[PDB]
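Pinned message: reference record for Cystic fibrosis transmembrane conductance regulator
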Amino acid sequence: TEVVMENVTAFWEEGFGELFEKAKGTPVLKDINFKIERGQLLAVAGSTGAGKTSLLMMIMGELEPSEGKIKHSGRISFCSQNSWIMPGTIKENIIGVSYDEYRYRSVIKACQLEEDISKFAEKDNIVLGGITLSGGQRARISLARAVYKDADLYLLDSPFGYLDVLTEKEIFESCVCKLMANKTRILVTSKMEHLKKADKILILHEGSSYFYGTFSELQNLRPDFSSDSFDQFSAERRNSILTETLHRF
Ligand SMILES: Nc1ncnc2c1ncn2[C@@H]1O[C@H](COP(=O)(O)OP(=O)(O)OP(=O)(O)O)[C@@H](O)[C@H]1O
Ligand SMILES: [Mg+2]
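Predicted structure (C-alpha cells):
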C-alpha cells in the first residue's frame, strides 16, 4: 500500500478538533504532507513531543484529522518504543498462532535471535515472562514479532532501545533494509544514518513539518541544518541537539 498525507491537521481533544473541521487549543500535528510508495521507507525524526508517535496513531485511526486527507488502505503492524513480552514461548511471542517456517527463520536471523534461542535446552520452546530477558533481547523479540506479522504497513516507533551502537546498525541493515525491502514501512528515529538510507524523510518540530523529502534534498535545501560522531551520541543527547537546531531554524 501507498501512504499519503495532504494538509493534515489533528487535535487530540475531540472538541477542539470538531471546531477546526467546522471552521475550515494547540494541534498535535499541523499541515502534514508526505507520500510513500509501496515498498518504500519513510524515516520520521524530531524533537520530543513533536508528534512522531501521534502521526503513527493517526495512521492507525487512533487520531482523526480535522482538515486534510490521509490515504491508506491495508493491515498495520505496529512496533512500539516500549517492548512487551507475552508469558509464553519465544516462538509464540514472535508468530502468535500463524506458523510459516521460512518466514520465521528469516525473521529470527535478521533480528539476531538465533544465538539467543540456542542458549536454552527447549530452544524456541523456552517459556518467557519464567525466563527473564535483557532490554536488548526484549527489544529484538518485539521487533521480530512486528516484522513477522503479515501486514501491509509496518510502523516502527524507535524499536532499537537498549541495543548497543553496533547491534542497532546490523539489525537496521538486516531487518529494516534487507528483509523488509519490499514492505511499506515508517521508522521513527534520531539516527542520521537511517535518514540517509531512507527513501523519504520527515522532520517534525512542535507539530510542524520542518522538512519532507530525501536526504539529498536535505543536503540541497538545508546545508546549515546538516552541518559522523552524531549517531555515537546517546538517545537523550541526539534528541537535545536535534531539538535546539530545530528551534534556531
Ligand atoms: N492519546 C493521547 N491523548 C491526548 N494527548 C496525547 C496522546 N498521545 C500523545 N499526546 C500528547 O501529544 C503530544 C505529542 O506526543 P507524541 O507522543 O506524539 O510525541 P513524540 O514526538 O512521539 O514524543 P517522544 O519524542 O517523547 O516520543 C504530547 O503533548 C502528548 O502528551
Ligand atoms: Mg514517541
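Pinned by admin. Summary line: The pocket of magnesium ion (ligand 2) is lined by residues 52-53, 81, 157 (CB under 6 Å).
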